[PDB]
Write an enzyme that holds these catalytic residues in place. Structure first.
Site, PDB file in Angstrom:
ATOM      1  N   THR A   1       7.091  22.320  73.604  1.00 57.63           N
ATOM      2  CA  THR A   1       5.712  21.990  74.125  1.00 57.63           C
ATOM      3  C   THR A   1       4.840  23.250  74.085  1.00 57.63           C
ATOM      4  OG1 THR A   1       6.415  22.189  76.370  1.00 57.63           O
ATOM      5  CG2 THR A   1       6.560  20.043  75.599  1.00 57.63           C
TER       6      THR A   1
ATOM      7  N   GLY B   1      11.926  25.675  80.523  1.00 56.43           N
ATOM      8  CA  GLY B   1      12.736  26.385  81.515  1.00 56.43           C
ATOM      9  C   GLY B   1      13.542  27.447  80.830  1.00 56.43           C
TER      10      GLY B   1
ATOM     11  N   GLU C   1       9.576  14.591  80.428  1.00 50.96           N
ATOM     12  CA  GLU C   1      10.625  13.655  79.896  1.00 50.96           C
ATOM     13  C   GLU C   1      10.029  12.280  79.641  1.00 50.96           C
ATOM     14  OE1 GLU C   1      12.872  17.129  80.409  1.00 50.96           O
ATOM     15  OE2 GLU C   1      13.096  15.381  79.036  1.00 50.96           O
TER      16      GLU C   1
END
EC number: 1.3.3.6
Lengths: 628, 625
Positions: free
Chosen positions: B139, B178, B404
């Protein structure tokens, strides 16, 4: 200026400057608010690091500092109009709560109204100069809602002319008051008065808790912070344990009742009103961020091969945000009506005012609470970051649903009035005010026009009438089965709260509808009408069963409601940015990179992340322990 | 033990031990999970200060240390089954997300399943030993939902046999992954592949970003933390900007496509599965905390003389919590059905699976998300304090509605499936599975019958599916564009998906009752199933009144029976939350503790909190006369 926002703003249907007037109350109130804001914005004393990048202890320190300075400066610049003080305090604190609130807003006003002349001599001047900093400590660990249950005792000792303030249990410990934990050296304590061998219920005492000068806790006083919370980092919400701590008799507040030297005993409507405005403001700030950010952000495709449109062009995105924008305007007008009303009423009015302020405080805080998170989710991933400003708006607004009267208890106070009004009408009495609709219950041929705010008000009135009647009859049925009023009340509490909710919903629709008729600017009146119609039709669409039952509307009419909501989205698209501009929130108030007035999100967001605390070193010290 | 919670537990109608077996799948699962949790609880290496008392920096350092220790401990105890590793990871992290998630769950598997033997030789054992820590950077600041619009490019240089990774714009910068901010020294980067002068679309590249050993960013790499978020303090959600950064041609992931040395080009569903169970768990914990607290907390009066009762005795408190406890159990069983379903298909039905996974992920996360906040408010003032543990459960669960697959996009993917099914039926074909009810496009609801209630939900879904299909058709005619009509019917389409998912949950809960062997557990699950289905009708009455599914008097009966189910659940509520088997350390809650001893523990917790490390705060200086 982002060219998307420049385009949206250029083809708006109205002048948002004139709508700003309408929200402030006049063109001069707009001008003066902006003056107060700009004097703060440009004052180095009110400046500090981005609060997102500070620890809790540092946030507390910044807030205290600003609150000390804010008292000095307002006094310096002769700011005394209550509206000007609100505008000053709001803007200084960037919408965070401020830790001198209970001293300026409770302790001081309570002395100035209730002090004996000697009290006045000991306290007025030091409380004014913040040599004495005070709070109000009522609630306990074991007792919030039910103050009759409080366990703190104030036992008179006639030998020494002193009251013995005690916290006999862990549950008796004073718990929550702002300014109690670190800021305050005095507290007005609420306590069960014991004199001779008799208890006279709840009375207030001035209790020094820290040494003036050093701020060291006094002997028999255990005082501190109740720990971190979802929000309110800036507020030292506190506990206060008293171990048979002696005060002078002269420290009891004796305007209304007295204890003689021999121990002989002689015999929240403002805050809830203000909270309706706060709900309006918090939801308006959220809609500002989300609607601007949805006009800046491009993502996904409608037409294949064409550029990614602004995500505000998706109907699902318009449906998330335009109903909330309409609500925010609805709550602005309710807020102003509650403030005008509360000001006038300040006695066949006390009960209608208490019921109305309680109900609208619950209804508007619960609605705004839900709407703020919807605005955050509407912003997608960047919503979840503190770059949005929406998490901080939410955690510092949400306690309004819990404190200053728990919203379910508030709705049940509204229900007590609605039942009492219902019984008065069924016993042949006239009722007035927001319950007048009960006089015309069919028990004591009508077709809805979905483009008429008046006809929609009528629909919402009948929905409320029907749910009031259902609560009253279910309560009556539970009384005849269970032969206890209190038990019947408990077992009808869900219906009672539904009736209060539908009643308050009707009040909000009615007030938005009536405000339309006072708007002089035609273009503003037209866009506000679109919002009033969207508010009203959305609530029908969302509560269709409440309008289908009792034949208030038909299934084909609900189909036309749903059709019209879709069309109102398409109308409000070209005006949505201009509408949130009219709120007139400065970037520093929104605390939002996504929501910034100029719409330069992406370049500011990269800077914000780079300036954030974990990027102070390239390598975190936790690397040199990770395996290899 | 708090004599209240004693009395509740002694007064239960069923054995919660045997419901725990049903939730886990077997008694042998219950014994194995508890043994794994016992292995962690006994280990001082997994202990640390209350995270509520620590700064973000300290929270990040605690979490990454616990993730490094967790890997070593799982290997020592030979934990290798995927369910056991889940049980292990969830206990250790105490709800919180963990920073090696993408290393363990994406980078290491991608090397096992997709890397060449020379890639595995460079990267695999360094990665397995945590000498390399990897993540997945897809992303970008500009692009989350629409990955086809990613701007990061990987240009092939045939002269130097290298890819040139570039982040040409501020929007191109990788944003969110993350472990990317501070933990990882390698990223798999998704980029637009350009070789010769043609773009071949999105491909994945192994990119070293920091020096092994010093952890210094490499030349051409800007990498850092995206800043603080509503939750996820433990996760270094990161950015990655590449300035024409050069990697070997051999760094491309080439299992499925190849770039030859001369530049010649040759030829989420699981995590959505899991997120259903994660929603069941986050709601189940929030209900545990609020129902126990509501049985410990006395306040206010019913009869004017009498002692303050437990707040759970107020109907309003039952209405806030029992419909959520029913929803928690409903979700526990949908979760177990989704897990068995995803397993059996993932070993023809890929369409149904994708649509069902998208829809239940969105429906369960949105519902749990609302339920967790409702639990916090139901605790009153103390709910707002971190002593409740409920704020930390909310801010760490809520990003499941956004990440998600953004929930609205997920519901529209369900709706695509419902529209394709409706069209099949209406061109005379037979549909199967979760949409078999659409083939059937006198019948009065029995409100004590889970089957009769299931039937009411099926008809509500069919009506809203048909309404979406008819509106879409009219808009297609009116707009001479399928894509504009889809946009202008999107609210109706999401509503249809919502109602379809709602039906599926009612159906699965109703069916689960017939497999319950213990009579007393069956009876109490039945009360929850009925409370769940009847609350849903009560809250969506218009959807049952329209199309003549149910009458006004039937709604009045629904609403009466919901009130009666609240009473009936009251005496079983504490044992029903106790059956989720959450340890105190997993709840992270003073209010919700298993022994009910709240007030003493609350006063300790406050005294031990940071602002009380000193009697006078540094800030007293500003509060002079």
């Amino acid at each position: 200026m982002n060219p998307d926002l420049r385009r949206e703003r250029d083809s708006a249907s109205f002048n948002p400057e004139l709508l700003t007037h309408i929200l402030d109350g006049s063109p001069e109130k707009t001008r003066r608010r902006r003056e107060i804001e700009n004097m703060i914005l440009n004052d180095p004393d009110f400046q500090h690091e981005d609060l997102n990048f500070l620890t809790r202890s540092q946030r507390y320190e910044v807030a205290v500092r600003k609150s000390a300075i804010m008292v000095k400066k307002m006094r310096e610049f002769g700011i005394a109009d209550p509206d000007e003080i609100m505008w000053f305090k709001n803007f200084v604190h960037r919408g965070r709560p401020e830790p001198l609130d209970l001293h300026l807003g409770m302790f001081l006003p309570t002395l100035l109204h209730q002090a004996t002349a000697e009290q006045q001599e000991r306290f007025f001047m030091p409380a004014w100069n913040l040599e004495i900093i005070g709070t109000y400590a009522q609630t306990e660990m074991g007792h919030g809602t039910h103050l009759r249950g409080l366990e703190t005792t104030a036992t008179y000792d006639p030998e020494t002319q002193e009251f013995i303030l005690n916290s006999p249990t862990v549950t008796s410990i004073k718990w929550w008051p702002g300014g109690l934990g670190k800021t305050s050296n005095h507290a007005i304590v609420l306590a069960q008065l014991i004199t001779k061998g008799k208890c006279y219920g709840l009375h207030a005492f001035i209790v020094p808790i820290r040494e003036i000068g050093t701020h060291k806790p006094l002997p028999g006083i255990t005082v501190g912070d109740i720990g971190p919370k979802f929000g309110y980092d800036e507020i030292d919400n506190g506990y206060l344990k008293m171990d048979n701590h002696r005060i002078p008799r002269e420290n009891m507040l004796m305007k209304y009742a007295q204890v003689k030297p021999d121990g002989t005993y002689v015999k929240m409507v403002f805050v809830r009103s203000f909270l309706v405005g706060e709900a309006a403001r918090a939801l308006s700030k959220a809609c500002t961020i989300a609607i601007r950010y949805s006009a800046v952000r491009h993502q996904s495709e409608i037409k294949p091969g064409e550029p990614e449109p602004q995500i505000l062009d998706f109907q699902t995105q318009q449906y998330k945000l335009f109903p909330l924008l309409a609500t925010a305007y609805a709550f602005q007008f309710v807020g102003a009506y509650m403030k005008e009303t509360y000001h006038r009423i300040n006695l066949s009015e006390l009960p209608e005012l208490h019921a109305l302020t309680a109900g609208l405080k619950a209804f508007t805080s619960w609605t705004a609470n839900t709407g703020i998170e919807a605005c955050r989710m509407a912003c997608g991933g960047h919503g979840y970051s503190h770059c949005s400003g929406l998490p901080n708006i939410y955690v510092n607004f949400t306690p309004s649903c819990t404190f200053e009267g728990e919203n379910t208890v508030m709705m049940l106070q509204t229900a007590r009035f609605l039942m009492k009004s219902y019984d008065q009408v069924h016993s042949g009495k006239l009722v007035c005010g927001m319950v007048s609709y009960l006089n015309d219950l069919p028990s004591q041929p009508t077709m809805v026009d979905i483009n008429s705010p008046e006809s929609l008000t009528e629909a919402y009135k009948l929905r409320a009438a029907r749910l009031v009647e259902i609560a009253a009859k279910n309560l009556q049925k539970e009384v005849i089965h269970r032969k206890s009023k209190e038990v019947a009340w408990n077992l009808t509490s869900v219906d009672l709260v539904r009736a209060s909710e539908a009643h308050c919903h009707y009040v909000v629709v009615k007030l938005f509808s009536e405000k339309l008729l006072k708007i002089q600017d035609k273009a503003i009146q037209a866009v506000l009408r679109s919002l009033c119609l969207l508010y009203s039709l959305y609530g029908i669409s969302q509560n269709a069963g409440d309008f289908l039952q009792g034949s208030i509307m038909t299934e084909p009419q609900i189909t036309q409601v749903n059709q019209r909501v879709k069309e109102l989205l398409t109308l409000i698209r070209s005006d949505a940015v201009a509408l949130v501009d009219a709120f007139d929130f400065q970037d520093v108030t929104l605390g939002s990179v996504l929501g910034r007035y100029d719409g330069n999100v992406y370049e500011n967001l990269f800077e914000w992340a780079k300036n954030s605390p974990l990027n102070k070193a390239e390598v975190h010290e936790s690397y040199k322990h990770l395996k290899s």
